[PDB]
Amino acid sequence: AEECDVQADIIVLFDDSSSIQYDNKENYQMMKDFVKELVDSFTTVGVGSQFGVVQFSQGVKTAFPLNKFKTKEDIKKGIQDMVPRNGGQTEIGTGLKHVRENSFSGAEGGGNPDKQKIVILMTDGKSNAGAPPQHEAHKLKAEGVTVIAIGIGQGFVKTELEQIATMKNYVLTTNSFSELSTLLKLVIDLACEVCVVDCAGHADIAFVFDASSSINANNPNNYQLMKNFMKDIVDRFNKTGPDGTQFAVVTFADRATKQFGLKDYSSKADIKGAIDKVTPSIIGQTAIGDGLENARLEVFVQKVVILLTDGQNNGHKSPEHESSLLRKEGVVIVAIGVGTGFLKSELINIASSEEYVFTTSSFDKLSKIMEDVVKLACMSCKPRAHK
C-alpha cells in the first residue's frame, strides 16, 4: 500500500464504451474499485486535494467536478454511483479536450496554483472518433497537467497512449480489468512524481552528439555551431561540478566514443573548453545506438541525455533498445535532428516523449529550439510517493 502527500487536483478519465460491458459484466466495478483505491492513496484528499471523474466514449459526461465532494467516502460513493453510458465510440481526444476546458476550470473547483494537476486516463481501446487526441493532449500538458495513461486488454494502441501521456513511462498496461489493481502502486508513484524546471538542481547531463563527416560536408562551420549550441546550454546552469550540474560528452560516428565523463570537470570554463576540442570523424556514419549504449555503460540525481544527429542509425546498436534501458533507469531523453538526413521516427523512438523531439533545417537555426531544449535540460523530477 502506497501513499502520496502531494496536494493535487486529480481528474480520472473513465472509458464507458460498450466494449467494456460486452467484454465482461463486472468490468465497470473493477474500474470503479481501482479508482476508489486511488482516492484512498492521497492523504490530503479530505482536508486539500480534490478528485473529479469524467466519463468518455461517445461524447463526454462529467460524473462529478473537483468541488462536488469533500471527503474520501463521499468521493468513493460518487464513483460507485456513476452510470456508464456504454457509448458506441471511443473519443479519447474529446475527453481530453473536455478535461482541459472544463474539469480544471475555476467553475469546477480547479485553478489553485498550490495544486498540481493530474489526469489519469483509462481505456480498453484506441481513439476512433472525435477530436484527435494527440493535439488535445499537447494543449492539456502545456497547461501544466501531468497525464498518466492506462491501457487494458488488446484493443488500445500503446503508441497512441505514449503520445498522450507526459512521458513514455507514464503509460501503463495490463491484459485484463481483473489485473488493473496490479498497477495501483505504479500509478501512485507516477502521480506523486513532481517535475520542475530547475537549472540549479543537482543533475547529470550527457550530450550524445553526432561526429560524422557529413556535418561539415557542405559547410565547414556546422560542427562549430553544434558545439556553441552545447556550450550555450552549459551556460544556463547555475553551478557545475559535484555540487551542481555535471556534464558529459559522447560522440558517435561509425561507433561511439566517450570524450569526457561526468567527473572530469567541475568548471564551466573547462567543460566548454572540453567541448571545443571535440573533433569530427572522417567517417560518414551516425551510430545513434552506439552513442546511447556508451552513455548507458560508460557515463551513468536527475539524469538527462540530449542527443543530436544529422543521419539515420547505422544499426550497430538499436536506438529503441538502448533508449528503453536508459529511460527505465530514470534518464530523460531529448532528441534533436538537424537537416534532412535524419529520420524523425528514430528521434521519437529514443525520446522520453515526442514533445521532447526537435528538428531544424540547418545548424544555424539551432537558436530556434534553444529555449525549449534548455527547459527540458533543466527538468528536475522527484518521487514523493512512499509506503
Side-chain angles (χ1 to χ4, degrees):
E2 190 95 322
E3 281 185 328
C4 180
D5 301 313
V6 176
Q7 287 168 44
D9 291 330
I10 307 158
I11 296 299
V12 176
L13 206 35
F14 184 114
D15 197 334
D16 65 348
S17 70
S18 54
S19 62
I20 313 288
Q21 202 62 350
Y22 285 162
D23 179 82
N24 194 304
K25 168 194 177 177
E26 296 175 354
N27 284 338
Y28 284 128
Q29 188 61 59
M30 298 193 258
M31 292 174 67
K32 285 178 165 187
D33 299 337
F34 183 73
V35 176
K36 294 192 209 176
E37 291 156 14
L38 291 179
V39 171
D40 292 331
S41 82
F42 285 85
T43 60
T44 63
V45 170
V47 167
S49 283
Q50 286 176 132
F51 220 95
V53 174
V54 171
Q55 298 168 223
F56 80 92
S57 53
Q58 186 273 309
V60 178
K61 169 193 186 178
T62 286
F64 55 83
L66 293 161
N67 60 10
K68 188 117 290 199
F69 301 117
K70 274 135 203 201
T71 66
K72 294 186 158 74
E73 212 69 36
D74 287 351
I75 292 165
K76 293 201 292 186
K77 182 210 183 200
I79 291 160
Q80 184 60 44
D81 292 339
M82 301 168 54
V83 177
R85 305 162 299 154
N86 293 306
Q89 308 179 343
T90 303
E91 297 185 73
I92 311 196
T94 306
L96 292 162
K97 185 180 176 301
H98 185 88
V99 163
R100 75 158 166 86
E101 284 182 345
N102 294 18
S103 309
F104 288 112
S105 67
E108 298 199 18
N112 184 332
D114 300 331
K115 301 279 269 298
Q116 214 163 230
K117 298 162 131 61
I118 312 170
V119 170
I120 297 154
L121 159 73
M122 292 159 88
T123 186
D124 80 338
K126 73 176 193 180
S127 194
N128 63 11
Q134 320 91 350
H135 181 57
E136 308 293 334
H138 179 73
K139 292 230 197 110
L140 182 64
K141 287 180 300 195
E143 291 176 356
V145 192
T146 297
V147 183
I148 293 160
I150 304 174
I152 301 150
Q154 298 302 321
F156 77 91
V157 2
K158 182 115 165 292
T159 287
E160 170 168 278
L161 292 196
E162 276 177 350
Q163 311 185 116
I164 288 162
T166 298
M167 305 193 298
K168 288 174 176 159
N169 59 305
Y170 289 66
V171 172
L172 303 178
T173 61
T174 177
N175 296 308
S176 51
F177 290 94
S178 70
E179 292 165 73
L180 241 181
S181 285
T182 59
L183 305 180
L184 183 57
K185 177 188 211 301
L186 284 156
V187 173
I188 296 162
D189 292 341
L190 290 157
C192 217
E193 186 90 12
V194 178
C195 293
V196 142
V197 177
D198 187 357
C199 301
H202 294 241
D204 290 334
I205 311 300
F207 296 110
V208 182
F209 271 32
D210 188 348
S212 173
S213 47
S214 65
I215 291 165
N216 277 3
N218 298 334
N219 181 0
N221 326 127
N222 283 339
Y223 212 59
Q224 186 61 52
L225 291 177
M226 196 188 56
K227 281 144 97 174
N228 301 341
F229 179 69
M230 288 187 282
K231 277 156 44 181
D232 290 346
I233 292 169
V234 175
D235 284 325
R236 308 292 223 89
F237 289 80
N238 182 59
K239 186 164 170 58
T240 54
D243 289 329
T245 313
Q246 284 180 320
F247 277 94
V249 167
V250 170
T251 66
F252 52 93
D254 49 320
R255 294 289 183 274
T257 299
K258 166 162 86 166
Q259 301 302 333
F260 56 98
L262 295 165
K263 289 168 173 193
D264 274 13
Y265 304 118
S266 67
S267 109
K268 285 180 198 178
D270 288 335
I271 288 167
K272 290 192 277 178
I275 288 159
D276 268 346
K277 294 192 218 209
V278 174
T279 54
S281 161
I282 58 180
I283 310 290
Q285 277 181 55
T286 40
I288 297 160
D290 286 55
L292 293 169
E293 179 212 27
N294 193 280
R296 187 176 56 89
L297 296 179
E298 293 228 341
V299 171
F300 302 110
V301 161
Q302 177 71 53
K303 302 179 297 294
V304 179
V305 168
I306 297 162
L307 174 315
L308 189 154
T309 188
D310 81 328
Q312 75 272 37
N313 196 55
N314 71 351
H316 185 247
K317 293 285 174 185
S318 163
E320 191 170 58
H321 176 68
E322 305 289 340
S323 55
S324 175
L325 288 185
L326 285 158
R327 294 193 301 276
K328 291 214 291 83
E329 299 159 5
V331 181
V332 174
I333 307 183
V334 178
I336 302 165
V338 188
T340 54
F342 70 92
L343 296 171
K344 204 177 179 306
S345 44
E346 298 183 342
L347 303 186
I348 288 163
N349 287 340
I350 69 156
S352 288
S353 168
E354 180 157 355
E355 302 280 348
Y356 305 169
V357 169
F358 301 89
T359 64
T360 76
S361 47
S362 75
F363 285 89
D364 56 12
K365 298 220 277 182
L366 285 167
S367 77
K368 301 240 150 181
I369 64 174
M370 180 62 174
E371 297 315 313
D372 284 336
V373 167
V374 169
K375 277 175 190 172
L376 302 176
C378 296
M379 182 195 320
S380 181
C381 309
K382 275 282 221 187
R384 287 273 273 167
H386 68 64
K387 283 175 184 190

